[PDB]
Amino acid sequence: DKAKRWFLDNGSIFLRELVADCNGKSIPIRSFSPEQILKATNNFDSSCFVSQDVYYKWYRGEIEDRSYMIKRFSEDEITGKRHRVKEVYNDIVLSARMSNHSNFLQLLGCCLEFPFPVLVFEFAEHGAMNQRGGVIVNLLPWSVRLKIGKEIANAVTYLHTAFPKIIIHRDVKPMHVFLDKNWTAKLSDLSFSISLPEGKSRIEAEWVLGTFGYIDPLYHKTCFVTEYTDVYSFGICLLVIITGKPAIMTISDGDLQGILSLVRELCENGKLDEVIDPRLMKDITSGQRLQVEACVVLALRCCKERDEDRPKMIQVAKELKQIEASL
Amino acid sequence: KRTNETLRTLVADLRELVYEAEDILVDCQLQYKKSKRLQEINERITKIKSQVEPYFEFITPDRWSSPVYDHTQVVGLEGDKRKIKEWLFRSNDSQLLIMAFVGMGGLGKTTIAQE
Amino acid sequence: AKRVQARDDKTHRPELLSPDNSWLLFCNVAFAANDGTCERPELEDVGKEIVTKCKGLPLTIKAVGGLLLCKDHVYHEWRRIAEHFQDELRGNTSETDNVMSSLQLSYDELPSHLKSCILTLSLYPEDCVIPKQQLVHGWIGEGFVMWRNGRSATESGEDCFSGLTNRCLIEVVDKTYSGTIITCKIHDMVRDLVIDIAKKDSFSNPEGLNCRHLGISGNFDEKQIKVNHKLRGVVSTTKTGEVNKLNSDLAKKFTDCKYLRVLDISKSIFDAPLSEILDEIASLQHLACLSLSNTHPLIQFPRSMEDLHNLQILDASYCQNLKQLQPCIVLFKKLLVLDMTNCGSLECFPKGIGSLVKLEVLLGFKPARSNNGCKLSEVKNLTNLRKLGLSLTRGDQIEEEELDSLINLSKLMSISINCYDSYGDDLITKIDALTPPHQLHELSLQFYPGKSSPSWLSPHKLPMLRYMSICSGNLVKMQEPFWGNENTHWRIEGLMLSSLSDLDMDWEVLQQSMPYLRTVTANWCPELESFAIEDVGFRGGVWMKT
Amino acid sequence: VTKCKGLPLTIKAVGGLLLCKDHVYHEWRRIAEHFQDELRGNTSETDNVM
Amino acid sequence: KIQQYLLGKRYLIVMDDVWDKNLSWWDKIYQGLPRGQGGSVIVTTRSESV
Amino acid sequence: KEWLTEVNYLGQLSHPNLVLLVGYCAEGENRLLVYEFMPKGSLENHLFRRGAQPLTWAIRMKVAVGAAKGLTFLHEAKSQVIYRDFKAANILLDADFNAKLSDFTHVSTKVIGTHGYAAPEYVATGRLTAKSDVYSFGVVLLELISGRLFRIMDTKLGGQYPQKGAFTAANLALQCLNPDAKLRPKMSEVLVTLE
Numbered sequence A: 001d002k003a004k005r006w007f008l009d010n011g012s013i014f015l016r017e018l019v020a021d022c023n024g025k026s027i028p029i030r031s032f033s034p035e036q037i038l039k040a041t042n043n044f045d046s047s048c049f050v051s052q053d054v055y056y057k058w059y060r061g062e063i064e065d066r067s068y069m070i071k072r073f074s075e076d077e078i079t080g081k082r083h084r085v086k087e088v089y090n091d092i093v094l095s096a097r098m099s100n101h102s103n104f105l106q107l108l109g110c111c112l113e114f115p116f117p118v119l120v121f122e123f124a125e126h127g128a129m130n131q132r133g134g135v136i137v138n139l140l141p142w143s144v145r146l147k148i149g150k151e152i153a154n155a156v157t158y159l160h161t162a163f164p165k166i167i168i169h170r171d172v173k174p175m176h177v178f179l180d181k182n183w184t185a186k187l188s189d190l191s192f193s194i195s196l197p198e199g200k201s202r203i204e205a206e207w208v209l210g211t212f213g214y215i216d217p218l219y220h221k222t223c224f225v226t227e228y229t230d231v232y233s234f235g236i237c238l239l240v241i242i243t244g245k246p247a248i249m250t251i252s253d254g255d256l257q258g259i260l261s262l263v264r265e266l267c268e269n270g271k272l273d274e275v276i277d278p279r280l281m282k283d284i285t286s287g288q289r290l291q292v293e294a295c296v297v298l299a300l301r302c303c304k305e306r307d308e309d310r311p312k313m314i315q316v317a318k319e320l321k322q323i324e325a326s327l
Numbered sequence B: 001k002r003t004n005e006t007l008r009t010l011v012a013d014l015r016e017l018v019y020e021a022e023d024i025l026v027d028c029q030l031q032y033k034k035s036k037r038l039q040e041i042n043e044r045i046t047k048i049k050s051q052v053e054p055y056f057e058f059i060t061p062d063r064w065s066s067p068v069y070d071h072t073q074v075v076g077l078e079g080d081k082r083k084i085k086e087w088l089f090r091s092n093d094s095q096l097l098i099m100a101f102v103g104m105g106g107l108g109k110t111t112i113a114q115e
Numbered sequence C: 001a002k003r004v005q006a007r008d009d010k011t012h013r014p015e016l017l018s019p020d021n022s023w024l025l026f027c028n029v030a031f032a033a034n035d036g037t038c039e040r041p042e043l044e045d046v047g048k049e050i051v052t053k054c055k056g057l058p059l060t061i062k063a064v065g066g067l068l069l070c071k072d073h074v075y076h077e078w079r080r081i082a083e084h085f086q087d088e089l090r091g092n093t094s095e096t097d098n099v100m101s102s103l104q105l106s107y108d109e110l111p112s113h114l115k116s117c118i119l120t121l122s123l124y125p126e127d128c129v130i131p132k133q134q135l136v137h138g139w140i141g142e143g144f145v146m147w148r149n150g151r152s153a154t155e156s157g158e159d160c161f162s163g164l165t166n167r168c169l170i171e172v173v174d175k176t177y178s179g180t181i182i183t184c185k186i187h188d189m190v191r192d193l194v195i196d197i198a199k200k201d202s203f204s205n206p207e208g209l210n211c212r213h214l215g216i217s218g219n220f221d222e223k224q225i226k227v228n229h230k231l232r233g234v235v236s237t238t239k240t241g242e243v244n245k246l247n248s249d250l251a252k253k254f255t256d257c258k259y260l261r262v263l264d265i266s267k268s269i270f271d272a273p274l275s276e277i278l279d280e281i282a283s284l285q286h287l288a289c290l291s292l293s294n295t296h297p298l299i300q301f302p303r304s305m306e307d308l309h310n311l312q313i314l315d316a317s318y319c320q321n322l323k324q325l326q327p328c329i330v331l332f333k334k335l336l337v338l339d340m341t342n343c344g345s346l347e348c349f350p351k352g353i354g355s356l357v358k359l360e361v362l363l364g365f366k367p368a369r370s371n372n373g374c375k376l377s378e379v380k381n382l383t384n385l386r387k388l389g390l391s392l393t394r395g396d397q398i399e400e401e402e403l404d405s406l407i408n409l410s411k412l413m414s415i416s417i418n419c420y421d422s423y424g425d426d427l428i429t430k431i432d433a434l435t436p437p438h439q440l441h442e443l444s445l446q447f448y449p450g451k452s453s454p455s456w457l458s459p460h461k462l463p464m465l466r467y468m469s470i471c472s473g474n475l476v477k478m479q480e481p482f483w484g485n486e487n488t489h490w491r492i493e494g495l496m497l498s499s500l501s502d503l504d505m506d507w508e509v510l511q512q513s514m515p516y517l518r519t520v521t522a523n524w525c526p527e528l529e530s531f532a533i534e535d536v537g538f539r540g541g542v543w544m545k546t
Numbered sequence D: 001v002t003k004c005k006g007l008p009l010t011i012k013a014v015g016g017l018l019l020c021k022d023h024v025y026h027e028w029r030r031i032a033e034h035f036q037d038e039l040r041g042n043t044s045e046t047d048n049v050m
Numbered sequence E: 001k002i003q004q005y006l007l008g009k010r011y012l013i014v015m016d017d018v019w020d021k022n023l024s025w026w027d028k029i030y031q032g033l034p035r036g037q038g039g040s041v042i043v044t045t046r047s048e049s050v
Numbered sequence F: 001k002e003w004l005t006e007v008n009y010l011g012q013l014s015h016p017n018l019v020l021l022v023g024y025c026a027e028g029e030n031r032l033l034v035y036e037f038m039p040k041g042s043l044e045n046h047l048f049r050r051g052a053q054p055l056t057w058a059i060r061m062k063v064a065v066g067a068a069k070g071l072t073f074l075h076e077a078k079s080q081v082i083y084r085d086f087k088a089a090n091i092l093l094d095a096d097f098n099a100k101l102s103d104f105t106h107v108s109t110k111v112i113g114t115h116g117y118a119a120p121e122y123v124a125t126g127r128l129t130a131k132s133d134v135y136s137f138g139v140v141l142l143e144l145i146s147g148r149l150f151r152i153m154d155t156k157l158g159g160q161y162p163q164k165g166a167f168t169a170a171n172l173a174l175q176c177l178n179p180d181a182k183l184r185p186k187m188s189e190v191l192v193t194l195e
């Protein structure tokens, strides 16, 4: 076959960057077969898909005795660029390196006879979180959502702080977030996370990119990356945790609801009376409204339009931790 | 120590002979080819000995330090000097204070002691 | 320093010079005509570049200033010296200043096996960071290390390595928490010295033909580095991150020697699978070690291994596709090291692993399932090993009455358990049946899907543990025997807790359970916050108590 | 010490070669089984009972 | 000794017939000579290298 | 498929402050749009270059009025054409100092507005409007004022007063740069209030 060719180049490409990343010391990657991925995805044409994006598709699956979560790619996109294929290789290598931290979604191997790789991860029956919530057949209590918030905060601080090179996963969205049986969130899809050089949290980037609303307008009108260019987007994520609403929204209104603008104008004028989650009005919220408005104040504070107005992401996680540690 | 050049060339030649001798010796464990290999390498060893030896028949055949130095070229050692002086001011707190200046060659050990 | 027994904190180690101080010294030596001031400003970049080539030794700086003080300050020979630096400093103006003599008198007072060990380090690039383990397997490979009194391979070569670091000929890059060394580098004047001593007897030519053993730096796919017939060893020296790309025909030349005791292929990509690349490794006979670590096209290592009766070290680590290990390794009974760490796809062994007895290191064991591979029962055979690495995946990997398979291992010093791809809850119950030997110097539970302690980690079950690290996992609390403070205590001297989200223990309770501590390195444990680390959350401290 | 059998000189030689050691149990055990071989190596002939 | 015996004196010293071999002894003793006193060295030699 | 469609999309071009139908190709590949020449380059080839030209008086204000005329050409007369491509490099000049514009769901890589051209609502939502057009035109006016009641925003002439265009332009920019979608400009008032 030509599939042997798919071996003998792709992994070799693969090899010369994880040696460039970890100097070869990594996690026990499993090498699977073609037919097991065609079997567990049921020839990749069913309703076992989790979610989609531009360059990849998240599916469920089941190889023997363990259901898995399988990521695959799109052939025409990555064969139609010749220069942004290094993002796929950065994705597989960084998703290998982050796999030991708990609030990331672990990697359980790689089969790569396919278009370029096809990746496999452990199973999480709570699916990927939607633009407002769970895509289970139906709805989460407030403590569970605040736990999700603090652990996504932990994982992004792990991205920024745990290494001599700061990797800023700028496109944090609830769509990248999975959940366990015990509702422990796990980030994934680091494909656009660029790796700065060391000692320099401020180096001019190459092009502005990524996800309207979560774009961080500061980087959109300055075009150089700092870590705050993630933190802004994080707060909007927390608002989806808070509201139960989509980020970009309309209610018969011109496809125009900047939900950040809505919550700040309901702060300065409406006085925090509509951030009280109509998905979860039936909750107790006796003293929990106190931590709710603390969360809304913090989520506005990290979404502030200037850098110095925004806390460092470590501090964001720390005051999140004190917020849930009040109870 | 204190060796002439003929000894140096002979040592450099005998090392090559040692390597090829224990190279071909491992093939012990027809005998004809191995016996002629043994012949050639034995005769080369004996020939080299015989023609080196009359040159040795023909002819027959220190480092110190002190507390005197210059203290003008001594580029700043005031931190190390300070630390070692506060080590020496604590001499009575032991019975016999012993100290070590450990490093590679030509690093500053004698000069930091002189300082 | 220890033979006089100075103290641990009465030693003093002077550091290499800062570039500003080194420039001051070089002006004070060379430009001594007026004050140590540079009397013309066009020689300054040349002088600063030569000074950066000196790299902080005062002695090389004073030697270079000595040979420039006999010079008329013309730009051209200053440029000349700025490109031909070590050649003039091994001419030493016909041996007057002699950097090389003062370093070589620290060379030549070595035992001759340490001479042969230190000479192989002349086969590396400029300032690459060299792994310790590869040097040790190289030294055991040519037989630069001998042994009789039990201390067979790894401790003997490690004693050789520590003997070289004690002579200040080798600088240690970074330790671990347990004090052990992983990576190594040498100063560049010492590198030139050991090259020039290799530029004698035909150890390393490194150009041309006559070479006893060669090393391959990066990308000889288009250079055609030349291999003659002698070649006692071939190692691959890569400067920490790039991959030495190798052509297929050169790998065909590697099977064409007859006297090749060391062959390791480490940062490499080949044009073909390594099965048919190395079909004729039967033609290699006296081969001691193979480190086929981190090479892409290796699905299956070649079948013709049965004509390898010596084979003291077999390393294939970190190659994520090593499916079927071959039963022909059960034949020859004379290896020392079998090292499969993090080899993901691997069906868990041939049968007679407990047959061959002389081996000391067994990493990434993967005990078999029910009617498969090999179990833990014959590991009880191996009364000479001292480093063992497990990697458990599910419950029927192990079996209950093989729980006595680790009690009688007398000489054992270390256990690493890697429960990464862990599924079964019964495994958590089946791991608790295992007991380590009561002598055990250091263990590492690095994934461990349990919630409480493993219910043997007590000072009762293992009194002499000194080092202990717990990496990632889903652990919650430690059980009651883990404290055990009626009369027993741990005497664990160093401790590491890497990424444990749910771990709950208390600081002064640890101190009243662990009286003899030096350092505790925790860095991702957001539950704790009671420690003396600057944050047990998002970064790490060490807590050196004094 | 019972392997030394009352000579002060062998005791001081064994204590001399153990004083250059980091008190790990394993090599102390090692010396407790390979006793005369290390004392005829004499740390490459330094203490030299023999 | 020579630091003491030459200290605070106006010393003249004649190094006669100095050759261009192993001349490093010069700057082993050049720091042994006190400075700022008027001391003078006269080296007579067959080399303007030295 | 690709021919009668693109001629219908490109045939509607008859406006003085734009580029007309000069030429095209046979374009088996992507866009080989051939539209000939602009002699003196762009605004940034005269504003943000220290090589050629210092300031003048309000002829660039006539350039901005002519480009605002071009806005009112494509927003009012044609029912649906949106520029989306406001740059000072897209604004091109003649010897007559006149503006001629050329060089034309959620997709990752952003191109529009590497600097403050893009609207904050287009940032937060991606709605792709004429409100972004008038906000971008307001900040182009700010670039004309800047070069980078005490309004000495110029660094080369401290005599902004006698035509009073500086105060009016700054106050219309205070009207343009308000963040919502409710106080928005309309371009004919920007035409009549800057002449």
Ligand SMILES: Nc1ncnc2c1ncn2[C@H]1C[C@H](O)[C@@H](COP(=O)(O)OP(=O)(O)OP(=O)(O)O)O1
Pocket (backbone or CB within 6 Å): B073, B074, B075, B076, B077, B103, B104, B105, B106, B107, B108, B109, B110, B111, B112, C025, C058, C059, C062, C102
């Ligand atoms: N800080 C310094 N400033 C100026 N010269 C220095 C400095 N440190 C060392 N030197 C010079 C003095 C000598 O000319 C040269 C060698 O240093 P020195 O102290 O004699 O060697 P060392 O004691 O480090 O090792 P060894 O005695 O084994 O050669 O370096």
